[PDB]
Amino acid sequence: FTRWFMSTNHKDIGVLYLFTGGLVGLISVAFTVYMRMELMAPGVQFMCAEHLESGLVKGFFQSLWPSAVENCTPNGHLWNVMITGHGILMMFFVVIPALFGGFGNYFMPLHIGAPDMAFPRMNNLSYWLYVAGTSLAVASLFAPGGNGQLGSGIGWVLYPPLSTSESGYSTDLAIFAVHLSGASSILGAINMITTFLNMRAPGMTMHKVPLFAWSIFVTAWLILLALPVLAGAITMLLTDRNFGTTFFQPSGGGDPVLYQHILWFFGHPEVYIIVLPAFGIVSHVIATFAKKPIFGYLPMVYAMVAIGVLGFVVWAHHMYTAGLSLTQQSYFMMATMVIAVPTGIMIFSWIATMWGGSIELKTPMLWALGFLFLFTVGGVTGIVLSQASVDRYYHDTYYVVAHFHYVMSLGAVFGIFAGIYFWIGKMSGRQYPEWAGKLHFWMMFVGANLTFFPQHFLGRQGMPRRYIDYPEAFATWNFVSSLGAFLSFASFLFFLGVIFYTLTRGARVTANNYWNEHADTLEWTLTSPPPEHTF
Amino acid sequence: LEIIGRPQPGGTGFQPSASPVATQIHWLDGFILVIIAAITIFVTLLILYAVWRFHEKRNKVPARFTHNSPLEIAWTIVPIVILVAIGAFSLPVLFNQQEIPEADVTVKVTGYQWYWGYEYPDEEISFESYMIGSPATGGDNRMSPEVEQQLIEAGYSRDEFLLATDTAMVVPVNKTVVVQVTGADVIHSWTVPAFGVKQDAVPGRLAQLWFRAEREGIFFGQCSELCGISHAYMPITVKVVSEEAYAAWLEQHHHH
Ligand code: HEA
Ligand code: HEA
Ligand SMILES: CCCCCCCCCCO[C@@H]1O[C@H](CO)[C@@H](O[C@H]2O[C@H](CO)[C@@H](O)[C@H](O)[C@H]2O)[C@H](O)[C@H]1O
Ligand SMILES: CCCCCCCCCCO[C@@H]1O[C@H](CO)[C@@H](O[C@H]2O[C@H](CO)[C@@H](O)[C@H](O)[C@H]2O)[C@H](O)[C@H]1O
Ligand SMILES: CCCCCCCCCCO[C@@H]1O[C@H](CO)[C@@H](O[C@H]2O[C@H](CO)[C@@H](O)[C@H](O)[C@H]2O)[C@H](O)[C@H]1O
Ligand SMILES: CCCCCCCCCCCCC
Ligand SMILES: CCCCCCCCCCCCC
Ligand SMILES: CCCC[C@@H](O)[C@@H](O)CO
Ligand SMILES: [Ca+2]
Ligand SMILES: [Cu+2]
Ligand SMILES: [Cu+2]
Ligand SMILES: [Cu+]
Ligand SMILES: [Mg+2]
Ligand SMILES: [O-]
């Protein structure tokens, strides 16, 4: 019934975030399949202007079947709309809601022995703002937009003057969507911080809080500084568009580059907001399946704090080719490099935790180990890109696309799958079938690497970001990348099958702790699922 | 002229270098690539070893250690050393790249939706440069018999489609070219991979880059800041030629 949606219990809200995150994730992944269909071969075959003359539904179905080039007038606006849609959904309405809204809301109170969040009614409202934001984001795709068509073709970061001059009101709906998301995140961070500080169990000292709870706490602070800044940036876009301001318009004495500083001031912290909870989950999973306590607990907490702090003083590595002086470029380059150090501490600590353990290669552990490998691959290309001299070549190419898909889609997402398999028994009372989880893992591992590794080659060869079509020479690695995406998509549909199976007819969970003694935090002390009212 | 600055089928490396800056980029990237491949191979081999050596079937009782001070010192300091080493070779390269020398040739480039305008202020030459196959040349941004014909007529082949423009920026070999870049409407970005240059074209700002081309030939770039519907369809053609061929091209533009 609609008694799930009106619930104020952190567990129910956690579950709502997870499911909704998953559904929006499916929609955004479906966009990438369409994107990789068009990128699979040079020449435009799918995104034809001719499909506009049909209806919405008829036009949709026609666009899924390839046309000959001679019958296909390239529609760049549709490409730019899908890309912007893919990016907005992921960065605002998918991964953070799942990790922070989902696992954060469900498990952080359990890990600290809190009965519920400080402000349960505020927690429920944070969910509905997320849903309202999502709805506006989706609606913007069907609203009058740029070039006399539907949707905003402006990139997930909304650079002016392009975002300010895009016609129709699709862009305004997108800006409202982002406001709602920021509001949802801010309320969530308020709750996480208050709960964490005030509602710990007697005896639960700061140095006794589990790492996941710490990851969520640090994350919550980043949100409080980052998200208000973003609300400023985007309100300024909204006023330039509607209320005669000219913050970013040179005719009125504005500067488009100012928007970039403000936006990236949110924009870097944003990626550390995505990844910190995944760092939390990896810590719990690895310790459990290595049957060994987490190595260097205190350096981990501090490395997370250090990463959180440094994430606020590096933003202009997104602006090396935007007109930054040599002094700014040198600074931001050196400040960005420092981040490798605490991150290295965490990678090596995770390896040290495994070292001398008794390793059980169950599904959650496979995601966690994939995370270590793939996050390292993404992280070191991040270090390449920090070198302004080399970023001169790589900026706005597919090399950057490869970096961020390794840290996010093969990093944060592996964190999400790690947590789902780790915790689904605890949350539902039902267990996933082990052979299916491993199959899911290997399909995703192979598919995701096939998708993104070849994008390094495309970037090195000079393929720009945000292109509907590309010179013939880029054909080989685009084709491979697209086959990788189709395989990854297959693994995701299989995953959804695994979840559906697990929840409807999965083996009954009977134990409080169905893993082992080294899953040693409070949730494993409770029933599966935990009682409606805990602690 | 030889087509040099272009992507090649199945390529996995950089585009050929034709400037000393591009050369520096290749070396620095090659140096960092060795390091980061060593780091990730190391990390990967550790994980695979630990999973093999400490599998539950082979190591039935787990250890309990959570510290190893000498190791934590080594693994904090060694990354710091690695980064400082990279920083030492990288900062000179950055300085050379961004310190604008005295120009032999000055070109002012303006980005528009969706084409580039070039002006040579010393020569009182200006012209616009459109993709072969754009609406300007009679097409609609796709390959066709007509577009292939125009590519041939202009000295290219169908393989240069999306790269070749109707007019090129021509410059003399072994001379310092300073390019002043701006945007007319939205932000664009002007780049030539073979020269190791890229500079955003921001409305209201005039920014500079330099290159010195070390061999003659044809070199392509593509707009590198999303700028609307035909972002994919406003490339850059630079022809590097001899001093005499350059003067010849200048005289062809002179109004008597
Ligand atoms: C999960 C999200 C996430 C994370 C965690 C990161 C992590 C990092 N990012 Fe990435 N990044 C993105 C998501 C993310 N990024 C996105 C979305 C963009 C593009 C936005 C857009 O334009 O749309 C981007 C773009 C981006 C750029 C701009 C490139 C360009 O547009 O031209 C830069 C530049 O410096 C950069 C750097 C880094 C660095 C140095 C790290 C560091 O945090 C990585 C540190 C990790 C390691 C280094 C590996 C582990 C360490 C060791 C094993 C120790 C040994 C290693 C060394 C000694 C090097 N990133
Ligand atoms: C979390 C962030 C995230 C994720 C997961 C993905 C996933 C994918 N992305 Fe995404 N991508 C972005 C963030 C992300 N992307 C951003 C920010 C941009 C920039 C947009 C812009 O330019 O403005 C971009 C741009 C971008 C491009 C370049 C577009 C261009 O420049 O024109 C391409 C090209 O192939 C691409 C492809 C893919 C593919 C094939 C996948 C996937 O199909 C890979 C396979 C992964 C899966 C099958 C699993 C997905 C799982 C989840 C999403 C979790 C769901 C939640 C639960 C289950 C609880 N993306
Ligand atoms: C007192 C009498 C006044 C006499 C002087 C008249 C001044 C002309 C107005 C200039 O505004 C123009 O409006 C066009 C129409 O909107 C734009 O075309 C744009 O819009 C068209 C959409 O119809 C597209 O076809 C074009 O590609 C696109 O450039 C064009 O850029 C813009 O400069
Ligand atoms: C830069 C990349 C590095 C990747 C990290 C992976 C390598 C981890 C190696 C861990 O080293 C172990 O540390 C233990 C603790 O320091 C030592 O135990 C020693 O100290 C223990 C602590 O009291 C005693 O219980 C033991 O008996 C005694 O052998 C043990 O010998 C040593 O092998
Ligand atoms: C004394 C009074 C003087 C009166 C002024 C004379 C009016 C002359 C009209 C010029 O308008 C041009 O129209 C083009 C065709 O519509 C536009 O191309 C635009 O639209 C094309 C078609 O979509 C694109 O391919 C181009 O890249 C894009 O720039 C172009 O920008 C715009 O300047
Ligand atoms: C002769 C043309 C080959 C036909 C291939 C069409 C494949 C389209 C599959 C669409 C699947 C939608 C996800
Ligand atoms: C650790 C990830 C590095 C990804 C870059 C791959 C580059 C390989 C290309 C080699 C150059 C061929 C000439
Ligand atoms: C090579 C001939 C140069 C001609 C020169 O006198 C004029 O372009 C001056 O504008
Ligand atoms: Ca295509
Ligand atoms: Cu960043
Ligand atoms: Cu562009
Ligand atoms: Cu452009
Ligand atoms: Mg850019
Ligand atoms: O970032």
Residues of B in contact with A468 (CB under 8 A): 232
A246 touches chain B (CB under 8 A): no
Both structure tokens of A485: 């995406």
Q: Is A150 helix (H, G, I), strand (E, B) or coil?
A: strand
Q: Are B193 and B13 in contact (CB under 8 A)?
A: no
Residues of A in contact with B79 (CB under 8 A): 340-341, 344
Rounded to an integer, what distance in angstroms lies between the CA atom of residue A443 and that of residue B35?
Answer: 30
Q: Is A273 helix (H, G, I), strand (E, B) or coil?
A: helix
In this complex, do B93 and A389 lie within 8 Å of one another by their Cβ atoms? yes
Rounded to an integer, what distance in angstroms lies between the CA atom of residue A81 and that of residue B54?
Answer: 49
Q: Are A432 and A506 in contact (CB under 8 A)?
A: yes
Question: The dihedral of CA B245, A471, A82, A157: what is its sign?
Answer: negative
Rounded to an integer, what distance in angstroms lies between the CA atom of residue A308 and that of residue B227?
Answer: 33
Ordered by where they begin, the domains of chain B are 6-101 (1.10.287.90), 102-254 (2.60.40.420)
How many other C-beta atoms lie within 10 A of the C-beta of residue A326? 14
Biggest CA–CA distance in chain B, Å, is 93
In this complex, do A341 and B202 lie within 8 Å of one another by their Cβ atoms? no
Chain breaks in chain B (C to N over 2.5 A) after: none
| Closest to A79 in 3D by CA, of B178, B228, B48 | B228
The partner residue sitting opposite B90, judged by closest CB among A70, A357, A389, is: A389
Cα(A46) to ligand 6 centroid in Å equals 10
Q: What is the enclosing helix (H) or strand (E) of A194?
A: helix A170-198
Q: How far is CA A122 from the centre of its chain?
A: 23
Both structure tokens of A65: 């079947």
Q: Are B222 and B235 in contact (CB under 8 A)?
A: yes
Cα(B227) to ligand 5 centroid in Å equals 17
Biggest CA–CA distance in chain A, Å, is 73
Residues of A in contact with B13 (CB under 8 A): 460-461
A355 touches chain B (CB under 8 A): yes
| Closest to A230 in 3D by CA, of A167, A180, A299 | A180
Half-sphere exposure of A119 (CA within 13 A, CB side): 14
Residues of B in contact with A389 (CB under 8 A): 24-25, 28, 90, 93-94, 97
Ordered by where they begin, the domains of chain A are 1-535 (1.20.210.10)
DSSP code per residue over B197-248: EEEEE-BT--EEEEEE--S-EEEEE---S--STTGGG--EEEEEE-HHHHHH
With 0-12 / 13-18 / 19 or more C-beta atoms within 10 angstroms meaning exposed / middle / buried, residue A469 is buried
In this complex, do A147 and B199 lie within 8 Å of one another by their Cβ atoms? no
Q: Are A275 and A245 in contact (CB under 8 A)?
A: no
Q: Is A5 helix (H, G, I), strand (E, B) or coil?
A: coil
Q: What is the enclosing helix (H) or strand (E) of B108?
A: strand B105-112
Q: What are phi and psi of A8, to 5 degrees?
A: -115, -5
Q: Is the peptide bond before A97 cis (omega within 30 degrees of 0)?
A: no
Q: What is the enclosing helix (H) or strand (E) of A333?
A: helix A326-338
| Closest to A432 in 3D by CA, of A514, A316, A310 | A514
Block residue for tokens 């909304």:
A158
Q: Is A378 helix (H, G, I), strand (E, B) or coil?
A: helix
Rounded to an integer, what distance in angstroms lies between the CA atom of residue A395 and that of residue B12?
Answer: 17
Per DSSP (E only), the strands in A166-256 are none
Instruction: Provide the β-strand partners of residue B120.
Output: B125
B205 touches chain A (CB under 8 A): yes
Q: What is the enclosing helix (H) or strand (E) of B21?
A: helix B20-53
Q: What are phi and psi of A40, to 5 degrees?
A: -55, -35
Q: How far is CA B148 from the centre of its chain?
A: 26
Please state the length of chain A: 535
Query: Obtained via which technique?
Result: X-ray
Both structure tokens of A240: 């330039």
The partner residue sitting opposite B36, judged by closest CB among A80, A154, A380, is: A380
Q: Are A160 and A240 in contact (CB under 8 A)?
A: yes
Rounded to an integer, what distance in angstroms lies between the CA atom of residue A427 and that of residue A424?
Answer: 5
The partner residue sitting opposite A297, judged by closest CB among B50, B66, B225, is: B66
DSSP code per residue over A48-104: BGGGGSS-HHHHHHHTTS---GGG--B-HHHHHHHHHHHHHHHHHHTHHIIIIIIII
Per DSSP (E only), the strands in A361-454 are 430-431
Both structure tokens of B89: 């070779």
Cα distances from A475 to residues A75, A106, B159, in angstroms, run 20, 45, 12
Which DSSP symbol is given to A318?
Answer: G
For residue A162, the chain B residue with the least C-alpha distance is B186
| Closest to A256 in 3D by CA, of A172, A165, A331 | A165
B101 touches chain A (CB under 8 A): no
| CA angle, A50 then A51 then A53, to 5° | 75
Amino acid at A200: R
Block residue for tokens 């420092």:
A338
Q: How far is CA B180 from the centre of its chain?
A: 16
How many other C-beta atoms lie within 10 A of the C-beta of residue B186? 27
Please name the residues between 127 and 156 in chain A that touch chain B, using a CB distance below 8 Å: 146-147, 153-155
The residue to mutate among A27, A32, A37, A47, having the most atoms of ligand 6 within 8 angstroms of its beta carbon, is: A37
Cα(A374) to ligand 7 centroid in Å equals 15
- R_g over Cα of chain B: 25
Rounded to an integer, what distance in angstroms lies between the CA atom of residue A238 and that of residue A243?
Answer: 8
Q: Smallest CA–CA separation between B181 and chain A, in Å?
A: 10
Rounded to an integer, what distance in angstroms lies between the CA atom of residue A215 and that of residue A209?
Answer: 10
Q: Is A118 helix (H, G, I), strand (E, B) or coil?
A: coil
In this complex, do B40 and A380 lie within 8 Å of one another by their Cβ atoms? yes
Cα dihedral A465, A480, A404, B205 in deg (nearest 10)? -10
In this complex, do A77 and B229 lie within 8 Å of one another by their Cβ atoms? yes
Rounded to an integer, what distance in angstroms lies between the CA atom of residue B179 and that of residue B200?
Answer: 12
Instruction: Classify residue B127 as left (phi > 0), alpha (psi -120 to 50) or beta.
Output: beta
| CA angle, B139 then A476 then A33, to 5° | 80
| Closest to B120 in 3D by CA, of B234, B246, B223 | B246
For residue B201, the ligand closest to its alpha carbon is 12
In this complex, do A356 and B196 lie within 8 Å of one another by their Cβ atoms? no
Both structure tokens of A87: 């990016």
Rounded to an integer, what distance in angstroms lies between the CA atom of residue A81 and that of residue A75?
Answer: 10
Residues contacting B100, CB < 8 A, separation 6+? B178, B208, B209, B210
Q: Are A306 and A338 in contact (CB under 8 A)?
A: no
Rounded to an integer, what distance in angstroms lies between the CA atom of residue A125 and that of residue B13?
Answer: 51
Block residue for tokens 């552990």:
A365
Q: Are B220 and A145 in contact (CB under 8 A)?
A: no
Q: Are A137 and B162 in contact (CB under 8 A)?
A: no
With 0-12 / 13-18 / 19 or more C-beta atoms within 10 angstroms meaning exposed / middle / buried, residue B125 is middle
Q: Are A481 and A455 in contact (CB under 8 A)?
A: yes
Q: Smallest CA–CA separation between B138 and chain A, in Å?
A: 13
Report the relative pairing of strands B236-241 and B169-172 from DSSP bridges.
Answer: parallel
With 0-12 / 13-18 / 19 or more C-beta atoms within 10 angstroms meaning exposed / middle / buried, residue B197 is buried
Q: Are A447 and A490 in contact (CB under 8 A)?
A: yes
Q: Are A210 and A172 in contact (CB under 8 A)?
A: no
Both structure tokens of A182: 């920021």
Residues of B in contact with A70 (CB under 8 A): 144
Q: Are B136 and B166 in contact (CB under 8 A)?
A: yes
Atom of ligand 1 at shortest range from CA of A157: 23
Q: How far is CA B117 from the centre of its chain?
A: 19
With 0-12 / 13-18 / 19 or more C-beta atoms within 10 angstroms meaning exposed / middle / buried, residue A416 is buried
Instruction: Provide the β-strand partners of residue B118.
Output: B109, B127
Q: Is A213 helix (H, G, I), strand (E, B) or coil?
A: helix
Half-sphere exposure of A5 (CA within 13 A, CB side): 7
In this complex, do B230 and A76 lie within 8 Å of one another by their Cβ atoms? yes
Both structure tokens of B152: 């041939």
**H helix intervals, A461-508:** 475-505
Ligand 8 neighbour B245 (Cβ under 6 A): no
Rounded to an integer, what distance in angstroms lies between the CA atom of residue A10 and that of residue A24?
Answer: 21
Q: Are A292 and A518 in contact (CB under 8 A)?
A: yes
Which DSSP symbol is given to A411?
Answer: I
Q: Which residue numbers of A belong to the known binding site?
A: 32, 36, 38, 41, 43, 79, 86, 156, 268, 272, 317-318, 395-396, 403, 405, 455, 465-466
Which residue, judged by its Cα, is nearest atom 1 of ligand 14? A268
Block residue for tokens 């990967």:
B44
| Closest to A290 in 3D by CA, of A362, A357, A355 | A357
Block residue for tokens 């190591």:
B59
Both structure tokens of A149: 């068509």
Ligand 1 neighbour A159 (Cβ under 6 A): no
Q: Smallest CA–CA separation between B59 and chain A, in Å?
A: 5
Rounded to an integer, what distance in angstroms lies between the CA atom of residue A138 and that of residue A132?
Answer: 10
Cα distances from B87 to residues A59, A339, B116, in angstroms, run 53, 14, 36
Rounded to an integer, what distance in angstroms lies between the CA atom of residue A331 and that of residue A312?
Answer: 13
DSSP code per residue over B127-184: EEE-BTTSGGGT--SS--HHHHHHHHHTT--GGGTTT-BSS-EEEETTSEEEEEEEES
Q: Is position B131 annotated in a ligand binding site? A: no
